[PDB]
Amino acid sequence: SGLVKMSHPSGDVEACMVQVTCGSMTLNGLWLDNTVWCPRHVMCPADQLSDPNYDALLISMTNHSFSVQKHIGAPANLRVVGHAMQGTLLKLTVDVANPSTPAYTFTTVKPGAAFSVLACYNGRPTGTFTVVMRPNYTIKGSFLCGSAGSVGYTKEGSVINFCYMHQMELANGTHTGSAFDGTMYGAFMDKQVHQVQLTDKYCSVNVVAWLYAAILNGCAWFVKPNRTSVVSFNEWALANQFTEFVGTQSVDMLAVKTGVAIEQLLYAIQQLYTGFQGKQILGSTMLEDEFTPEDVNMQIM
Amino acid sequence: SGLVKMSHPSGDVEACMVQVTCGSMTLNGLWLDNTVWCPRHVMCPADQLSDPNYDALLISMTNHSFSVQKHIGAPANLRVVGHAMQGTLLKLTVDVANPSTPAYTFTTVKPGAAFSVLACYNGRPTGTFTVVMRPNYTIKGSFLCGSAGSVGYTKEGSVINFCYMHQMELANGTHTGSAFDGTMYGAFMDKQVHQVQLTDKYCSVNVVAWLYAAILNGCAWFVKPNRTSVVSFNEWALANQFTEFVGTQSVDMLAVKTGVAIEQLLYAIQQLYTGFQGKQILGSTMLEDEFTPEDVNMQIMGVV
């Protein structure tokens, strides 16, 4: 009954991690059914990562180019019987179906949404943590060299939604990766040139959730009777580095649980961005946008 | 690079979780070999929790009083064939041995040490997070009603150190539990009465680690030539709600890597205690003390 960074139990997804090796290069892959997903830059030699030619590289491969070992749990015999390139991912086909494939889906996450990351090295889970997809389509993770192919996901019921496969580091503590459709979040290129990122923003709905959590724990000094409408807050947001606020039923439950209307918190957010004055809020003298409405509902029940 | 709140993968420990039911009370238990560990207040009924007689509650039990079900993973029912009390924990014996018992130890952690927690409800793992054993022998986590028996651990190679089993809430967001020798952390009582908690302190050595992580991630604005000695800082600490700084080799690797001495960050902590004056350090506006030197070394350099 505090507000902490919380991840899904990782057991489910650990049972799907494998190591993919191609020549002298190695990284992680995700083994679902008869498929192993991994980043395509496993085909690329270190010196050529500046300007790879993936179309060339793909051609020069046979199935015997790809080596897949399973280290965690039950071992280890995966023969690659096919290989395809899908955007910034490779799609390897293997002769054995993962007996431990969860019920799963492949939905792309949106800015502000949270997901769990299983950080792996050489096909071995080493740690798990949770992030939110930034409005500029980066995440703030904890990745060293060799973590490519680490998997990000969410869990509703026993259905895993795989939403992220790690690719690269754009700057200090700034990362991105692929959705399992093969597209890179934020359209960054999987080559090692410096690329510019768009400006970041506060996730408005996540700040509202956080303010609700502060109220639910007795910190409500910022609540006034004043209101800003959603439509009016969103005009303001455009020019002050906040995202468009979009209401959800998860926000609505917090409004009911506390007696404070969304529009009062939208007004407070406008004030708090001018300054906290004193003044702390679970505090912190700055806005928190890394907890979702769902986060706050499940941890402060 | 990047520094996040990082937990161990929980697959190992998930396979060990079970539900223990006794009368009307239900919570989580930990299943190792032929033993299921759970908090003993599962014997105490709804209202008697104000103050219970645990020696009495124990005698009024047989093995049939206890029901253990494994819900997640490899399904099972486990018959209880013995029962004992040890401190604040029951030690239940079951007929089937856990076929996925990890290599493990039972060690008690000291204040400032971090560990992973697997939060469970009704024998089902729902989330994992990392905590530090606070100087006042509480932990700050997310434990709702029904999470007693949730388990905390550190992992070293294949060996899991089990160091915590959740017991109770105290103040808001303030929790405590048992080591697996049965002793409650900070001598608290498993009882719905109120007990006095010592004041919290900042874990100075973790704050230093966090500041080194800042420097290593390109955030060094708080670094000045000025220095406070360890001895001097520790006198200051007593008066200002900080722990005694004790250096380790792990802190030293960070001093070597950044070129910034410990004594420079001791002086910076004294200046940052007052306040960050509108700036932030790794996205925070207050000192962070739940990143340990070992944790920072592992995330930033992959080292021990």
> Is the same domain home to B159 and B52?
no
For residues B178 and B185, the answer to whether their CB atoms sit within 8 Å is yes
Q: Does B273 touch chain A (CB under 8 A)?
A: no
Task: Give the resolution in Å.
Answer: 2.6
Residue ending a domain, choose from A102, A131, A163: A102
Contact A172 B218 (CB under 8 A): yes
- Spatial neighbors of A199 by CB under 8 A, at least 6 apart, are A136, A241
Q: What is the DSSP letter of B222?
A: T
> Is the same domain home to A177 and A78?
no
Q: Write the Ramachandran bin of B23: left for phi over 0, alpha for psi from -120 to 50, otherwise beta.
A: left
Count of C-beta atoms within a 10 Å radius of residue A226:
12
Collect all residues of chain B within an 8 Å Cβ-Cβ radius of residue A283: 285-286
How many domains would you assign to chain A?
3
The number of residues in chain A equals: 301
> Is the same domain home to A216 and A299?
yes
Count of C-beta atoms within a 10 Å radius of residue A214:
24
Question: B126, B121, B149, B160: which is closest to B30 by C-alpha?
Answer: B149
Question: B242, B263, B248: which is closest to B297 by C-alpha?
Answer: B248
- Rounded CA separation B170/B222 (Å): 36
> Is the same domain home to A8 and A107?
yes
> Is the same domain home to A95 and A225?
no
Q: Does B286 touch chain A (CB under 8 A)?
A: yes
Written as six digits, the tokens of A2 are 């505090």
Count of C-beta atoms within a 10 Å radius of residue B208:
26
Report the run of H or E that residue B230 belongs to, with start and end.
Answer: helix B230-239
Residue ending a domain, choose from B53, B75, B102: B102
> Is the same domain home to B302 and B218?
yes
Residue identified by tokens 């080799």 is B249
Q: Among A127, A172, A173, select the one facing B8 at the smallest CB separation.
A: A127
> Is the same domain home to B24 and B131?
no
CATH number of the CATH domain containing B289: 1.10.1840.10
CA max distance for chain A: 68
Question: B298, B277, B296: which is closest to B286 by C-alpha?
Answer: B277
Beta-sheet pairing, B76-78 with B114-121: unpaired
Which technique was the structure solved with, according to the deposited record?
A: X-ray
> Is the same domain home to A5 and A112?
yes
Residue ending a domain, choose from B77, B102, B127: B102
Count of C-beta atoms within a 10 Å radius of residue B164:
27
Q: Does B2 touch chain A (CB under 8 A)?
A: yes
Domain that includes residue B59, residue range = 15-102
Q: What is the SS3 assignment for A112?
A: coil
Written as six digits, the tokens of B23 are 């009368």
Q: What is the SS3 assignment for B190?
A: coil
Q: Does B74 touch chain A (CB under 8 A)?
A: no
- Rounded CA separation A132/A5 (Å): 11
The amino acid that residue B255 corresponds to is A
Residue identified by tokens 């009368």 is B23
Residue identified by tokens 């908090």 is B39
Written as six digits, the tokens of B297 are 């070394």
- Rounded CA separation B101/B158 (Å): 12
Q: Among B125, B129, B175, select the one facing A5 at the smallest CB separation.
A: B129
> Is the same domain home to B304 and B210?
yes
> Is the same domain home to A247 and A281?
yes
| Beta-sheet strand order (sheet of A66-69) | A66-69, A17-22, A25-32, A35-39, A89-94, A80-86
For residues A19 and A26, the answer to whether their CB atoms sit within 8 Å is yes
Question: A243, A242, A252, A241: which is closest to A296 by C-alpha?
Answer: A252
Written as six digits, the tokens of A181 are 């459709």
For residues A106 and A53, the answer to whether their CB atoms sit within 8 Å is no
CATH number of the CATH domain containing B195: 2.40.10.10
Please provide the DSSP assignment of B61-118 as one string: --GGGEEEEE-SSS-EEE-EEEEEEETTEEEEEESS--TTPPPEEE-PPPTT-EEEEE
- Rounded CA separation A84/A237 (Å): 43
- Distance in Å, alpha carbon of A111 to nearest chain B alpha carbon: 18
Count of C-beta atoms within a 10 Å radius of residue A159:
11
Residue identified by tokens 């990284």 is A27
For residues A64 and A78, the answer to whether their CB atoms sit within 8 Å is no
- Spatial neighbors of A262 by CB under 8 A, at least 6 apart, are A208, A230, A245, A247, A251, A252, A255
Question: A204, A294, A202, A201: which is closest to A251 by C-alpha?
Answer: A294
Written as six digits, the tokens of B164 are 């915590």
> Is the same domain home to A63 and A114?
no
Residue identified by tokens 């499940």 is A298
For residues A175 and B2, the answer to whether their CB atoms sit within 8 Å is yes
Beta-sheet pairing, B159-169 with B104-106: parallel
> Is the same domain home to A55 and A79?
yes
Collect all residues of chain B within an 8 Å Cβ-Cβ radius of residue A14: 9, 11
Residue identified by tokens 């955007």 is A87
Q: What is the SS3 assignment for A283?
A: coil
C-alpha dist (Å) from residue B23 to A163, A191, B29, B76: 43, 61, 15, 20
- Rounded CA separation B291/B2 (Å): 13
